[PDB]
Amino acid sequence: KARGNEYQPSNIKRKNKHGWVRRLSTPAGVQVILRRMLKGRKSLSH
Amino acid sequence: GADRMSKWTSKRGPRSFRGRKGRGAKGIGFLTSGWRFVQIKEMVPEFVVPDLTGFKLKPYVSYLAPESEETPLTAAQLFSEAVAPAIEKDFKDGTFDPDNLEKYGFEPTQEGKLFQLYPRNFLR
Amino acid sequence: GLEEFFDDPKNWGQEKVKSGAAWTCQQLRNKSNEDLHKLWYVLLKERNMLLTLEQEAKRQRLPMPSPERLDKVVDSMDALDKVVQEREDALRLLQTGQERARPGAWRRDIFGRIIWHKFKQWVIPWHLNKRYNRKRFFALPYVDHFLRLEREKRARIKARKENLERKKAKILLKKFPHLAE
Amino acid sequence: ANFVSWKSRTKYTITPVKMRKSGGRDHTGRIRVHGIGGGHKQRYRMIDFLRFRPEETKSGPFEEKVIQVRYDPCRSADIALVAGGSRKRWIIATENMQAGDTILNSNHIGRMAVAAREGDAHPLGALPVGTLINNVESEPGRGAQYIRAAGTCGVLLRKVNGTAIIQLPSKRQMQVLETCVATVGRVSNVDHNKRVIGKAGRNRWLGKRPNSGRWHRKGGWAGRKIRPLPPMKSYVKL
Amino acid sequence: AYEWGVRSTRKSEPPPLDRVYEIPGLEPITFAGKMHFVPWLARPIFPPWDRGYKDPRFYRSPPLHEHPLYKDQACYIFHHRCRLLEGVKQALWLTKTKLIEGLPEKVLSLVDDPRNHIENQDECVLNVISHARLWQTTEEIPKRETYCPVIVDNLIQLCKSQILKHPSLARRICVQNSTFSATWNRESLLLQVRGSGGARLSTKDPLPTIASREEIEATKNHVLETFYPISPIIDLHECNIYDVKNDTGFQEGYPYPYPHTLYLLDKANLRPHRLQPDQLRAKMILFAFGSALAQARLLYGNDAKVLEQPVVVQSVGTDGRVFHFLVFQLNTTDLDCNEGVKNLAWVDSDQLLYQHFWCLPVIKKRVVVEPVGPVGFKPETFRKFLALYLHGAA
Amino acid sequence: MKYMVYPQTFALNADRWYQYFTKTVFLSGLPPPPPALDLAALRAVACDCLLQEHFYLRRRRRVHRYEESEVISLPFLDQLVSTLVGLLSPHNPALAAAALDYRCPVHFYWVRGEEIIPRGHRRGRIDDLRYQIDDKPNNQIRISKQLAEFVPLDYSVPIEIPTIKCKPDKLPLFKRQYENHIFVGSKTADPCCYGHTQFHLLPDKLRRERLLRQNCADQIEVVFRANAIASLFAWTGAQAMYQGFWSEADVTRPFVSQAVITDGKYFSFFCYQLNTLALTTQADQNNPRKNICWGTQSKPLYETIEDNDVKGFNDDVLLQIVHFLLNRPKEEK
Amino acid sequence: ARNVVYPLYRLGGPQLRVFRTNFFIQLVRPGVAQPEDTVQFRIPMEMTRVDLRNYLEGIYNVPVAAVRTRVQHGSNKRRDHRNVRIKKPDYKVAYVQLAHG
RNA sequence: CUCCGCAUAAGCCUGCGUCAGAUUAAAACGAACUGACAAUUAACAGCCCAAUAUCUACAAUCAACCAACAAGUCAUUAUUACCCUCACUGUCAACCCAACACAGGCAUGCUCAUAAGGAAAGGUUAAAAAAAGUAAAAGGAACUCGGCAAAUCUUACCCCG
RNA sequence: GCUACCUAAGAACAGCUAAAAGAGCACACCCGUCUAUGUAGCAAAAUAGUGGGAAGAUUUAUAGGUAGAGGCGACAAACCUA
RNA sequence: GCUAAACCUAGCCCCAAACCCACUCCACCUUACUACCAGACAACCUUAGCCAAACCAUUUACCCAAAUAAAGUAUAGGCGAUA
Ligand SMILES: [K+]
Ligand SMILES: [K+]
Ligand SMILES: [K+]
Ligand SMILES: [K+]
Ligand SMILES: [K+]
Ligand SMILES: [Mg+2]
Ligand SMILES: [Mg+2]
Ligand SMILES: [Mg+2]
Ligand SMILES: [Mg+2]
Ligand SMILES: [Mg+2]
Ligand SMILES: [Mg+2]
Ligand SMILES: [Mg+2]
Ligand SMILES: [Mg+2]
Ligand SMILES: [Mg+2]
Ligand SMILES: [Mg+2]
Ligand SMILES: [Mg+2]
Ligand SMILES: [Mg+2]
Ligand SMILES: [Mg+2]
Ligand SMILES: [Mg+2]
Ligand SMILES: [Mg+2]
Ligand SMILES: [Mg+2]
Ligand SMILES: [Mg+2]
Ligand SMILES: [Mg+2]
Ligand SMILES: [Mg+2]
Ligand SMILES: [Mg+2]
Ligand SMILES: [Mg+2]
Ligand SMILES: [Mg+2]
Ligand SMILES: [Mg+2]
Ligand SMILES: [Mg+2]
Ligand SMILES: [Mg+2]
Ligand SMILES: [Mg+2]
């Protein structure tokens, strides 16, 4: 029916899906963190 | 939809997240069955406050105190002030030996001491 | 007791309160360790009193009688800490030769950056620590490109700074001809 | 993925063990078998298929009293709890096995045959020719694997040159050694194949997800295939 | 045979070792000096590490065979949790006793006098049942763990309210958290009963002997029944690290040493957890025998002989609705043999205090059918309980 | 939302706050008074119970100090109460038919005072101050008859009830919302509805040594008084509401009760008489009645326990326990 | 102390002692009605109630009976130039009850 | 009027408390806008539990009769080790997900019509067309693709599944 | 974090007839047959009336898993952040 | 007459020269920025396509260590495009 509310907040889910440990577990996430550091993002991970 | 810029504190998240996070206070004990906390007196820091009766020093210094040269304390200066007189005296008297530096004040190993310079096992 | 958190009742409400100078590094070196300890506690009491007065002034929307006293106390305490640290460092250098009181090492991180890793106190050996072993202190051969890109970015920043400085010098010389000599 | 098998217990016990459903997913999280998922919660009860398992500090033939015969969710047959000496075990109950009976497990092979008393376990060589058996083992000490389902039974067709020729429920001939221990009689729940599901929800209760709605055109594999009986499967190694 | 435990769940094997160690005379270069792991350098071999100082929270016990009280001979321990398979028959075989149905005539006749009856017996027992099953707590339906001990305590208090009629009832107390241990032999098998929990009636007057020397001697004709092919030591904790001691539950000088009656409860809220009546009766018999044997060994020494003075111990085992009564008379300490003088056990089994209790009214077709309260109340069970309580005093 | 009033509390000066919350005035000493007994036998029984719980019973576990309370003192109190009531049943016939409850819940819910909500959408609205007491006395005695009144219903005292100068939240006292219970230890259908005597055991958290270390030396009697007042007020109010009296229908007769607080070694005795339930502001604007709580200072029952001997047994404390148990309801003509 | 590495403790061992503490407190006027024997302080996060009690009993010689601490959170709602949130620092509010009336 | 309301969980993070200003509220004083100053105090929850061997067949449904199948959340023992105590974190609000002060979405416990929570009308007049309702002479489907809508709360069938 | 399917441990289902129900009437609750309104709307799918189910193949809270030459699907070429 | 209009700096771009970064204290790979317990998880492996050949299927330039010249020469290629 009505859409737009696909984001149901959940801190545990957010930290597990997007987090420092999750990024550093795999080499791809390390590359993502490296790209964010190179660009200069204030927030590198959720 | 979450503020990534804000600092992640113990006030955010579910009950487990809020309870597993602290503000930086050092632990003074441990948990046991029944979620029962046992406190360790030795782990609890003990303040050392001296007696301030008859202490002539005051928080401020009068502006009439003359200016003095600034000389930061160095290892060589400390050795000259403390160990050099005794070493020179023993050398002149002939009693000097290269095996009693510990007698002169040297510490071979910090192990076995309550206060160890390296690694520092004592608080300020 | 709780009276020490407040200034003298006669001095309460005064617009200005007289104060002396702050203890200097040489003056504090001239004193013994026990004297430094007692003076540190006295300065701590004075600093607590001044912080209480400042907070109450902010609460009552009135100017502090003498803000400079807090700065003087802070400077004196910093000088005392500096003197004590100098004595401790000299004694450590004499007895053991180590510069720092906390063991550390130069480690390459997972991102290829060389950092100073300060050791922590543990009970189990280093190899038996699961959480410590989970940490990576090496960079696989996919960070070299990012390191090169960061180096090039820093070089660009430095070149921009130098060129801007040269342009400013040229503009200054143009405005003031006599600076050529 | 993070898939840890629930089959982690290494010690036998009669206590029911909680089992985790798979839903047809393998350790990679992919659907490897379709039509599996859901169903009623079940606990697994370990079954000792090695009928001749003498307890420690003992040897030779023994006998066990059947304490109980009851239902098992993990299999179509019934499970008999029995006790021998100081050891209590679960086995597969035969067609006629109730409380108070005394089953006999033996490994003795003689020139004469045996009475073949229902649930008793005897070697194939000891068992008489043309006898109904169940829970046979391919190799000595391997454990019963080839007759387990409810109402299934094989027949000892032949005993030639120290080898036993049996007829599996699929009517295929299987040759094994004569020292393989087998249990006489038929397995319990003879009328298992006569059950009626009744409603589409009973399959869901048994954890059988419905088939896909896609229409697949039948090919050359379909149609009746009259084929000769496969050759005898022999595990006797020369 | 089938082996339990799949290799995926089993611990993974370590990775193969590098060949620098295999090569002789060559010192491997590892990351042991770097204090962290690097893929290129070889994996060091770490020597075993001992903590040195004893940390209670991180203590690892020595191997089982290195314990001081380790014996190759196996002792079969029976505790409160143990549930016998055969039940009463196995308990009789282990305890070397003969079973007699029905309570002793003396105990039954102790309450035949209407004077010994409690005033308003039926009303008081109904009030006790209603209080335990419905009025105990704020919950609509109190659970068994709540209403079984309450029932037992209220019945004990109601029986104890007869001190005016019998002054001897003031010479007894009730003790909780009392543990006793006894050890004996049966066909060269070492058995040990460790009874813990429950309520122990502690008195200073020993119970009179229920039976007579004529019956004690006539018990020789009785032969214990076997249950082949089931070993008598089945469903008992077989242990190798054990100690053999004869403890009566209290130190010397206790004012109330004699165990009069032991109250056992089956209060688990789950039917699988609750013991069967046969298992509960077997547990009662074993606990009574253990208490009697401990008292006999304390009084007459550790020697094996025929007790000139038999030891009488009573037991009441209940589940909140069903009761079982036992009077056990120990007559001998020579238990190794299967023949000779045997103990006695008068057992009354499966006495229902009530049939069912309705915590809420039953309404069918808008008409009340079953009012709240006990259904099928039987005062004979309470009369037998009162007789057991008053035994040795009235 | 309601304040959870804890009888055994770590709060400081909580006795005055509880007096304000219950409209109770505290008096010192005992209320004025309106076959042969063997004191030697009673002392022997008490010593036997104490020695059984301390020395005679062979513990199978290394009893720690934290466990010591539940290991020793609670069974000791239960067994002592049981033996004493059994021995005093001949002297007091009411104890024979009395019901002895071991660790049963006691609840009471009452409203006193009003507040103005400071913030939220409910700002500037009158909200009643609600309180809930959830107590589990170790041992209590219930009967079907009510004990005689200590003082008349209109009795007055010169001592004024203390008034708190701030909110109850500074006690500290916290608010929570859950089911409101009014319980006497049993449901309304129980014939034994009135109370005779309660027995309370202080927890390890409120022990004398810990209070001395925390500099709460003067707070021991405060804790005793607070626990006694809260428990007895809850019991009396629950009994009154079971009889049918509430804020708008105040009690026509006083409801009396007795409490014995103990820490295993020290005992204190309290008597409470509920004279009013109109604690709400509307019904208390013109209510002159005051609840009264009589109390006694804590005294040691014994000095030390050495081997098979008890040192310094307190016959006065034993006799006070005996008198509390021997108090009996009046008999009508 | 603050911003220091506490030595690790093992069973037995010596007592952790601090000689020159750097914990600075300030006695603040309560914003709401408080009991007479109640004093309110503002302290850093790294200071516990036990540490505050020892601090008061050793430095100022104030008898202390009970200490209750809470963490007060500063407002981050304010937006400065460039629409960037400015974080008001958080602190710890401590309530101390005098131990001798 | 009461669709609710109160509390917890989840979520957000100071977001109608005081003072000094009144930008601003889909009008407007209110204040939710600006600055400064206060605050939420643990008993309620989170944060737990030494080792090696070993034990655990008997459902819940008031669990008592029967009655089943889909076969079921809710246990130990033996030995060794173990004197020591009340730390830390959450506690505010008119609040979350939908670009909004959005008629949408939102899990539980209690209340079952309220003891708690709110206001459909800025003022006037009563044109057309439009929307939601009420009532209607006589006829009662003659309307229409079709009894669509509304009212009363029928009978007998056919095709497909 | 929506949704398709699955895994682990949880929760809810008033009342009436019959009780043996993938049974009937009928609230919470789920879904969405028909009509009207709205069509830059209150809403990038809603409101009112009227409807189907409502002890089961039901609804639902939390955590985890299946990732695009794919997943998943009681096949609608469905769903996989409008 | 409002709304408005106008500005000259901040700085940036291309070269040249020169091979740049690194730790007051504390915290930071677990839910990063979290004082403090029994692990063993460790890296390596042809790029493919768009496009051109007027479709497309073989094929289609992509700095690899000296500017220029040899030289778009030899040579390769559905001997076509082109290399
Ligand atoms: K089956
Ligand atoms: K918010
Ligand atoms: K037509
Ligand atoms: K909407
Ligand atoms: K093309
Ligand atoms: Mg969105
Ligand atoms: Mg969801
Ligand atoms: Mg199956
Ligand atoms: Mg099919
Ligand atoms: Mg099909
Ligand atoms: Mg707190
Ligand atoms: Mg708690
Ligand atoms: Mg709140
Ligand atoms: Mg929903
Ligand atoms: Mg209202
Ligand atoms: Mg309007
Ligand atoms: Mg208008
Ligand atoms: Mg009409
Ligand atoms: Mg027509
Ligand atoms: Mg018609
Ligand atoms: Mg027409
Ligand atoms: Mg219609
Ligand atoms: Mg159909
Ligand atoms: Mg499941
Ligand atoms: Mg229903
Ligand atoms: Mg149905
Ligand atoms: Mg229906
Ligand atoms: Mg189709
Ligand atoms: Mg199609
Ligand atoms: Mg082309
Ligand atoms: Mg084309």
Between CA C155 and C1' H144 the distance (Å) reads 84
The DSSP symbol for C112 reads S
Tell me which residue of G20, G26, G28 sits closest to G2, measured CA to CA: G20
Compute the distance between CA of residue F322 and CA of residue F261 in angstroms, rounded to an integer: 15
Would an 8 Å CB–CB cutoff place G38 in contact with chain C? no
Residues spanned by the domain of F261:
1-330
What region, left, alpha or beta, does residue E148 occupy, with left being phi > 0 and alpha being psi -120 to 50 degrees?
A: alpha
To test the contact with chain E by mutation, choose from C124, C127, C130, C135 the residue with the greatest count of E C-beta atoms within 10 A, namely C127
From chain E residues 9-28, the ones with a CB under 8 A of any chain D CB are 9-10
Q: Which residue has the tokens 């050398």?
A: B91
Tell me which residue of E166, E101, E94, E158 sits closest to E126, measured CA to CA: E158
CA distances from E72 to D56, E61, E75, E187, E221 (A): 15, 19, 9, 18, 36
Angle, helices C144-175/A27-39, rounded to nearest 10 degrees: 0
- Residue G99 burial class via C-beta count within 10 angstroms: exposed 0-12, middle 13-18, buried 19 and up: buried
Q: Quickly list DSSP for F204-243.
A: GGG-HHHHHHTT-GGGHHHHHHHHHHHHHHHHHHHHHHHH
Compute the distance between CA of residue D29 and CA of residue C125 in angstroms, rounded to an integer: 37
List b or e across D125-145, with b for residues whose CB sees 16 or more CB atoms inside 10 angstroms: bbbeeebebbbbbeeeeebbe
Q: Please check whether residue C143 is in contact with residue A34, taking contact to mean a CB–CB distance below 8 angstroms.
A: yes
Tell me which residue of D100, D107, D227 sits closest to D177, measured CA to CA: D107
Q: Is the CB of D208 under 7 A from strand I?
A: no
CATH of the domain at A30: 1.10.287.3980
Cα of A10 vs centre of ligand 7, distance in Å, is: 10
Side-chain-side CA neighbours of G9 within 13 Å: the count stands at: 20
List b or e across D197-206, with b for residues whose CB sees 16 or more CB atoms inside 10 angstroms: eeeeeebeee
CA distances from C159 to C148, C167, F264 (A): 16, 12, 83
| Beta sheet of G38-43, edge-to-edge order | G26-27, G38-43, G91-98, G64-72
Between CA E171 and C1' H90 the distance (Å) reads 56
Between CA D198 and C1' H107 the distance (Å) reads 36
Compute the distance between CA of residue F54 and CA of residue F306 in angstroms, rounded to an integer: 10
Instruction: Calculate the CA dihedral of residues F227, F230, F234, F240 and round it to 10 degrees.
Output: 120
Strand partners, F139: F102, F199
The angle at the Cα of C143, spanning C138 to C144, to the nearest 5 degrees, equals 110
Compute the distance between CA of residue B49 and CA of residue C34 in angstroms, rounded to an integer: 11
Instruction: Calculate the CA dihedral of residues E279, E281, E285, E286 and round it to 10 degrees.
Output: 20
120-179 of chain D touching strand H, CB 7 A cut-off: none
CB atoms within 10 A of CB E155: 25
Q: Which residue has the tokens 């009996």?
A: F328
Q: What is the count of structural domains for chain F?
A: 1
To test the contact with chain F by mutation, choose from E121, E137, E245 the residue with the greatest count of F C-beta atoms within 10 A, namely E137
CA distances from F312 to B81, F47, F54, F268, F301 (A): 67, 11, 16, 17, 8
Q: Is the CB of C37 under 7 A from strand J?
A: no
CB atoms within 10 A of CB E133: 23
Q: Is the CB of E58 under 7 A from strand H?
A: yes
Chain H bases closer than 7 A to any CB of the protein: 6-17, 34-60, 62-64, 70-94, 96-99, 104-105, 109-110, 116-118
Output D152-157 pairs: Cβ under 8 A, ≥24 positions apart. D152/D186, D152/D187, D153/D185, D153/D186, D153/D187, D155/D130, D155/D131, D156/D124, D156/D127, D156/D128, D156/D129, D156/D130, D156/D131, D157/D129, D157/D130
Chain I bases closer than 7 A to any CB of the protein: 1-2, 5-9, 16-19, 22, 32, 43-46, 56-58, 62-67, 71-76, 81-82
The SS3 call for residue F128 is: strand
- Cis ω for the linkage preceding B119 (within 30 of 0): yes
Compute the distance between CA of residue C85 and CA of residue C96 in angstroms, rounded to an integer: 16
Q: Is the CB of C59 under 7 A from strand H?
A: yes
Compute the distance between CA of residue G29 and CA of residue D114 in angstroms, rounded to an integer: 100
- Consecutive H or E run containing C163: helix C144-175
CB atoms within 10 A of CB D157: 16
Would an 8 Å CB–CB cutoff place F216 in contact with chain G? yes
Pick from E134, E164, E254: which is nearest to F56 by CB? E254
Asked if residue E114 is part of any domain, the answer here is yes
User: Strand pairing of F106-116 and F126-135?
Assistant: antiparallel
H helices within chain E, ranges in order? 19-22, 88-95, 105-110, 121-133, 144-160, 213-218, 277-300, 379-390
Compute the distance between CA of residue F106 and CA of residue F133 in angstroms, rounded to an integer: 8
Residues spanned by the domain of A9:
4-46
From chain B residues 39-68, the ones with a CB under 8 A of any chain G CB are 39-49
Query: Looking at chain G, which subunits does it touch, using at least 3 CB pairs closer than 8 Å as the criterion?
Result: B, C, E, F
Q: Which CATH number fits domain D1-106: 3.40.50.300, 2.40.50.140, 3.40.50.12780, 3.40.30.10?
A: 2.40.50.140
- Phi, psi for E373 (deg, rounded to 5): 140, 170
Cα Rg of chain B, angstroms = 26
| Residue contact F90–E153, C-beta within 8 A | no
The DSSP symbol for G59 reads I
The SS3 call for residue F311 is: strand
**Residue D204, CA: closest nucleotide via C1'?**
I57
- Residues in Cβ contact with D179 at an 8 Å cutoff, skipping those fewer than 6 apart: D107, D109, D123, D124, D125, D140
Q: Please check whether residue D4 is in contact with residue D25, taking contact to mean a CB–CB distance below 8 angstroms.
A: no
Compute the distance between CA of residue F253 and CA of residue F151 in angstroms, rounded to an integer: 10
Compute the distance between CA of residue C32 and CA of residue F128 in angstroms, rounded to an integer: 64
Residues spanned by the domain of E253:
67-393
Compute the distance between CA of residue D137 and CA of residue D144 in angstroms, rounded to an integer: 4
- Phi, psi for A29 (deg, rounded to 5): -65, -35
Which residue gives the smallest C-alpha to C1' distance to H35?
A: G78
Compute the distance between CA of residue E281 and CA of residue E323 in angstroms, rounded to an integer: 10
Compute the distance between CA of residue F54 and CA of residue E341 in angstroms, rounded to an integer: 40
Instruction: Measure C128 CA to nearest chain E CA, in Å.
Output: 9
Cα of C47 vs centre of ligand 25, distance in Å, is: 72
| Residue contact E49–C128, C-beta within 8 A | yes
- Consecutive H or E run containing F74: helix F74-88
- Consecutive H or E run containing G67: strand G64-72
| Residue contact B4–A43, C-beta within 8 A | yes
CA distances from F280 to A16, F111, F232, F274, F286 (A): 53, 6, 19, 15, 11
Q: Which residue has the tokens 């009069």?
A: E260
Q: Quickly list DSSP for E284-343.
A: HHHHHHHHHHHHHHHHH-S---EEEEEEEEEEEEE-SSEEEEEEEEEEES--SSSSS--E
* Amino acid identity at D137: E
- Residue E264 burial class via C-beta count within 10 angstroms: exposed 0-12, middle 13-18, buried 19 and up: buried
Q: What is the count of structural domains for chain E?
A: 1
Tell me which residue of G1, G71, G2, G22 sits closest to G42, measured CA to CA: G71
Would an 8 Å CB–CB cutoff place G10 in contact with chain E? yes
* Amino acid identity at F76: F
- Consecutive H or E run containing E357: strand E356-358
Tell me which residue of B36, D15, F164 sits closest to G36, measured CA to CA: F164
- Give the start-to-end residue ranges of the domains of chain D: 1-106, 107-187
Asked if residue E143 is part of any domain, the answer here is yes
Would an 8 Å CB–CB cutoff place C153 in contact with chain A? yes
Between CA E269 and C1' H58 the distance (Å) reads 14
Q: Quickly list DSSP for chain D.
A: -----S----S--SS-EE----TTB-TTS-BSSSSB---S--EE------S--PPTT--S-EEEEEEEEEE-TTSSSEEEEEEEBTEEEEEE-BSS--TT-EEEE-----SS-----TT-EEETTTSPTT-EEES--SSTTT---SS-STT--EEEEEEETTEEEEE-TTS-EEEEETT-EEEESPBS-GGGGG----SHHHHHHTTBPPPP-------TT-S----PPPPPEE----
- Cis ω for the linkage preceding E229 (within 30 of 0): yes
Q: Which two tokens stand for residue B46?
A: 């003990």
Strand partners, B46: G17
19-58 of chain B touching strand J, CB 7 A cut-off: 20-22, 24-28, 30, 43
**E and F touching (3 or more beta-carbon pairs closer than 8 Å):** yes
Q: Which two tokens stand for residue E91?
A: 């308990």
> Domain D107-187 adopts which CATH fold?
SH3 type barrels. (2.30.30)
Q: What is the count of structural domains for chain A?
A: 1
Q: Please check whether residue E357 is in contact with residue E374, taking contact to mean a CB–CB distance below 8 angstroms.
A: yes
Ligand nearest to the CA of D215: 10
Side-chain-side CA neighbours of C66 within 13 Å: the count stands at: 20
Strand partners, D18: D43
List b or e across F300-318, with b for residues whose CB sees 16 or more CB atoms inside 10 angstroms: ebbeebeeeebeebbeebb
What are the counts of helices (DSSP H) followed by strands (DSSP E) for chain E?
8, 15
CA distances from F146 to D62, F32, F197, F257 (A): 73, 18, 12, 9
Pick from C136, C142, C149: which is nearest to A31 by CB? C142
* Amino acid identity at F38: D
Q: Is the CB of F63 under 7 A from strand H?
A: yes
Q: Please check whether residue E209 is in contact with residue E309, taking contact to mean a CB–CB distance below 8 angstroms.
A: yes
